[PDB]
Subunit: 376 residues, 5 copies
């Protein structure tokens, strides 16, 4: 992920113009190769027309260029790109939202699975580890980066997400389908056991655990679905064909023709199709947006940092359910205990935010007349 | 389903251009027949104009071609295609999301319906089988592929989703409406029985089971609704008529006219309407997107693999609630038990993902001044 | 509702072209009258120009036609139609989703309201009848079809949804507002009574019943809201005015002018504005989409089959909570009891769906190198 | 709110054309003043050109008109209007959905807060009154109509939503922020008290009450958010500037020029810019859609009937929790008790809806062949 | 936030035209600098052409201007702006909706955490303070304004959101990741403790608290996600490049050429590109919409008032759970106790809202015929 939120935090002269100078995750990095290819084909045609063709071949080439220019219709292609890329961007954000995060589970497990002893620690850590393990199994199934981190289940074991006994059980399960869900069933069984032993003190707690389990497992499943059900291939081929047809029409019809021929709209020879090149950059980059986002789980600059998320999730969940279990600071009176109201101070750099009238609602400046406000 | 996620995983020179070479699920496979028909009509008209018509008939044909060219307006047709196809694509994804999946139920059933004995196994397996049976009943009602797998209820019985006693009960139910919901009521009754016998140990557990039951049953119902309430036929006819009218206007107005007549924009005879053909491919393919997706439950390449999902769901649910019931590996200390932090290693092929600064939030490089940070 | 899902199940040569031959629910059925009116006005103007006007009046008419042609701008009108019709279509689908369906309630009631005796039957049937009654009350308030089935509350009583004692209570309730919600309060009171008597065995069950009650009642309320809050009238008038202005501009500016006058783009007299007629069909039909969908509860071909849904819902709910209460087939071992795996067979017509590789995830063909997969 | 659902219930010749004759809530009512202003400016310019300017000033005016006509680009302005107005319309519907309605609470309170005595009545009525009071407080904060009904808290008290003791408590609360939430906290405290006294019989009931409380309170909060966070002012200014720039370009460039000058596309002097006027009506009305909907809580014709909703909600909630508490008709056998099936009759005016085949699913006419249906 | 809801409350002559006069949060404030730069470049080119270039250089400049004018295509750029800005606006609203608000928690805590004593006060205040503290930690991570208010954790402590003992615990937690979630785990542990001591009286109450905790914590997490996952940089660069390319094409191709040269569409020299300037204002402002909204957590006029929300949330939560705990006014009969119906009065300024017929549903004016309403 290429984060540039800090760069667009507060209004700056130029707006996004400053973002135009970024390389990592940039259109330039993604598009320079194709740009040069388009320019090379264009310049090869121009060179042929300028230095190879006979006079008659030149007149015919001019006829072809003029005819082809009529078909460089950016309107429809703009329509299709807009709709298709918007679909892809929305799908990409939804996928990111389907990443399984243990925070909700870790809150519930810290609050409901009890015991300072080793057995209670084992329960809490094992439940969170099962969640992380389901996450790892699915992510290695859908993400190139995570897979290359865990190319085999042996790696998952050596990395500590799965124990050896667990792998024996996992492997003996006779299923030809992806087993990412297996740790979630392990979680359910362990939670039921914890309740039976009384580590979970009430049935409502066990219900809360199972609910959050299924929220987490549902996110894992959603990741599988997004990996499996691509954007319809036919649609992608359609949009690509539209774009490439536009580029063909442009690479022929944007040729600079001899001004001495006096053709309409061919009076200036620039030798370099500057505006055609900018148009190519715009439209090809627009499609590149979809090309980047259609599979966000790779090793690219702006792909999701899935391995980072795995590390963070495991470390934080372990801390939450083990180090922080039943380790509160003593209840003490807060700074505003004796204060009827409460407002933390402001720094000198922020006190200006004050003195802005406190919004109460849009109606509170109407100033109605007396006789009008009398009840019937 | 034609999965091509692996092909668009990491940025590749050309982007989708590589997808243009795919046959299964492709625009080419879906469109070649119509393409050839359009070309045949176009070439028949051209042949008539070139070799049959008298001189006067040729002048009149030229007048008609010029007049018809004015009406080949791809702008509006692009609008309508964009909006309509987007609606269809969104509906298609929503339908896929309404496929009933037992994973949530199987987690709950593994965690809440107890007993290693045969009776407990019977309870768990029967509940999951009822879920799968509702799924089969609805899918055979809405999916051509599943129906051809289960053309009669006898097939459902022989396949083991419904027992003989159950079919007697199912058939005696006097209802003229689709009975896919019947196993969900069976599920509810059986769950209540399991609670009464104490196999379900608490009321909160029975509530969780019934909640997940209704989530699953609601997905089944949603499938029925999507099958029943088509995209409004009037809308589909409107978009089709717009497209075909464009194709008529093009098949006449894109004829190559005799350059010797010196008509404006008719100076080059290519004999093959290359750009018109590409435009036809683009627009007809764009509509084909909707045509493919409007009913995703058939036997086409990119239709949902419903029978595969049935197999997977049944096998996995059975495993989860029967083989994996109360079969945990012993609680054991994990690899990171004694480690204050925790981070699994990286493979040599992935360690580069490290050393990327750990994102903490966009504000954490601001570097405010000392006097500014003093509280008021 | 005009269901055509079966027609677009599997890819067919022509795609939607086959749908163009449908009459029920079709654009033709909805639009022929207006089409003929447009053609009649057009032909009346043409007849006047051809056979009534003096020479000078003809020159002036030609000037007017040429001027009016400049204003037949289908671009903006396409924009507004796209956005407005899309809003209407989405609203229409949301409305359909707000139809109250008893299936969830019937599952809960079958599972939670107990007793094979007459009193238990009375409880279950009465709860489901109250749900159906709320549905009937709201549907008769928002649907012309349902209202004409139940033009008075007396009809509701004679149809059995409301008893005589209930109507006395219903009518004595002093409320000037729509009383569709009254049976939902009756439901809540009866459920509380059932719990008090122990017919509902636990508080979590009563909570589940009340939750599903409010889901159902919320759907009823949503139907009321959709009936009350139209699409803003101003918006509808705006889109209609845009469309009609286009049609005026076309009915004047698409007149065939005398070719002997030699006006630009007026060289061919077809006597019939074929492409103008197709354009009218397209655009007027596009708006007709909204016109049909804006109120989906009437007696039209593609309106929702609300009366059918009432019949189905009542019959199915009654069956579920009465005939099927506590009437399970004996628990018996399933066909796959002794099978470690499980897969139902395939018919000869479907076995081809097999042998397609079982999708495990997009990463599982990467084939990493040995030294790359070593952990750091 | 201007309800016109009944007018568009069933297909009618002309479709929306009949809606064009409506005045209340209409584009005409909202736009006539601006229309006349545009026409007045246009006619003032035309009068100057026709009767004031010298010959040279006329040639220069003609040059200006021709130049200005090039910039009347309705395409982009159509784009921006489409996107912006769609955003506003969606926001408007979401706001309406955030109106707090007591129906869910009243169902729960009727079902869970017990006692026919005066104390039980006090509990139920007071809880519902607290909900209504929160609704009133927020609505008077966000709605001009409601505020003018309750310009001061004294009005709220005299209207009975807040008692005198409650106002003392409400006013003594030292908070500079809007206090609409205070009755929701009162509700929570009272509910906890009711449970403590046993008026609420179980903890699951109290939980249901608090859940529905927070749903209601969340809707109130959402109303505050929509009131506070306008559509970004910059966006609104952008769209307005685009529209007005188009109107400037049109008011100059749509001037009728002297045909004797023989300028291209200026050959007919109509003296009245009919199509320009229709275009103004269309585009200005399109923006008026947003202008009407951007704040739906005023006293306009099509603003939400917030005061009506207050009246209805209070009356209905009071009836539901007080008059209808524990006042069921005796459980009695329904009309279909002895009937295996069940279907209410149809009126002569609706029986035609019958005989339409009962939809069972799209697959149930496939008619597979015998040998194909054999299992492998 | 620049609230202008009160200005667009009721229809006003001109509609948004009055908003065009606003400075704070306005397009003018955001765009004047760029506007002047565009005008300066344009005027520098014009000055060069008018006063520096030789005659031949002038003919060549004219050729360049004419060629460049062909490429000022506002159509596609309008498409891309529409789609991209709409995505940004929707994301902005979603972000605002992810702001963590304690109101739901404070309702639950006031209702479920009991005791008038100091210990009960400590429990309630500490739980709400933990929620506020998580909110502060995340907001200082994602918001420039909040960060500059709390540049260091020491500020958080001195402001009273975190105690000294809590900071010791917070700092000793060995985690390299953002710790905003830590107070939510503290909350869970404290809630479990409160239940264990009986301050929380039932398990369903503790479950409700933990559910609302995770709703709140999920909002905090969502804020982190929105801060981290920018709108894809490639997309932003694409849209910016499209816009700037249009501005380049305009700054050259909108030059006023010498009318004495008699070029087509260059007959009037205005010296100031009025319409080009308006177009620049429109399009650049349209992009500015996204530029403003892409990061809404800064110190700009229309950024979210995050510090205000912190103050309000803390003060209100403290009041709700401490001052207002178990402090109800005595249950008393309401004004409408003895009234069968109930309707609060109207002010003279609002009674007109009455006499509008009370909407009962769209069907209730149909007036069916007698023989038609007979049941079959
Ligand atoms: C115009 C279309 C063709 C573009 C051709 C490629 C652009 C220029 C080649 C740059 C080579 C890689 C730069 C690099 O290796 O440098 C990485 C560095 C930090 O990466 P970061 O910027 O993501 O942080 O960035 C930098 O030095 C800043 C990189 C410079 C930005 C490119 C400007 C393009 C022209 C604007 C119009
Ligand atoms: C071109 C615009 C003007 C159209 C004028 C009206 C169209 C022709 C008149 C048909 C009269 C009613 C047909 C009918 O009463 O027949 C119902 C029958 C079953 O109804 P169903 O098809 O819904 O099943 O359908 C049928 O016979 C099939 C009906 C024929 C389809 C119409 C084809 C229009 C031309 C295509 C271009
Ligand atoms: C064309 C653009 C300029 C329009 C200028 C204003 C339109 C005509 C002035 C009408 C005065 C107010 C009518 C009125 O005070 O009457 C209210 C009455 C019931 O109100 P309601 O119709 O909402 O029910 O409605 C009626 O008499 C029906 C009102 C007549 C509808 C207006 C037709 C416009 C031309 C169509 C093209
Ligand atoms: Cl619960």
């Amino acid at each position: 992920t290429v984060t540039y939120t800090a760069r667009v935090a507060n209004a700056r002269f130029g707006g996004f113009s400053q973002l135009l100078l970024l390389w990592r995750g940039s259109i330039y990095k993604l598009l320079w190769r194709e740009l040069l290819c388009f320019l090379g084909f264009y310049m090869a045609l121009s060179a042929a027309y300028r230095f190879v063709l006979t006079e008659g071949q030149k007149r015919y080439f001019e006829k072809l260029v003029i005819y082809c220019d009529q078909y460089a219709s950016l309107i429809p292609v703009s329509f299709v790109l807009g709709f298709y890329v918007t679909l892809v961007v929305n799908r990409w954000w939804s996928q990111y939202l389907c990443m399984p995060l243990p925070d909700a589970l870790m809150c519930v497990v810290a609050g409901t699975v009890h015991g300072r002893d080793d057995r209670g620690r084992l329960y809490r850590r094992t439940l969170m580890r099962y969640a992380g393990l389901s996450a790892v199994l699915i992510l290695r199934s859908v993400s190139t980066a995570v897979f290359k981190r865990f190319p085999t289940i042996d790696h998952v074991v050596e990395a500590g997400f799965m124990t050896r006994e667990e792998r024996k059980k996992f492997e003996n399960l006779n299923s030809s389908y992806n087993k990412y869900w297996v740790p979630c069933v392990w979680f359910s069984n362990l939670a039921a056991q914890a309740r039976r032993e009384g580590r979970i003190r009430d049935n409502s707690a066990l219900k809360l655990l199972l609910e959050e389990l299924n929220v987490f497992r549902g996110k894992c499943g959603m990741l599988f679905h997004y990996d499996w059900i691509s954007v319809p291939l036919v649609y992608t081929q359609v949009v690509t064909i539209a774009l490439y047809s536009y580029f063909l029409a442009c690479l022929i019809g944007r040729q600079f023709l001899d001004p001495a021929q006096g053709y309409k709209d061919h009076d200036l020879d620039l030798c370099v199709p500057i505006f055609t090149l900018l148009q190519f950059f715009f439209y090809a980059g627009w499609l590149k947006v979809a090309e980047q986002l259609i599979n966000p789980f790779g090793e690219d600059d702006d792909d999701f940092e899935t391995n980072f998320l795995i590390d963070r999730n495991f470390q934080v969940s372990m801390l939450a359910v083990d180090e922080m279990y039943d380790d509160l600071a003593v209840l003490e009176k807060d700074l505003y205990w004796d204060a009827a109201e409460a407002r933390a101070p402001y720094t000198a750099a922020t006190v200006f935010q004050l003195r802005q009238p406190s919004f109460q609602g849009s109606t509170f400046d109407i100033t109605l007349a007396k006789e009008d406000m009398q009840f019937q």
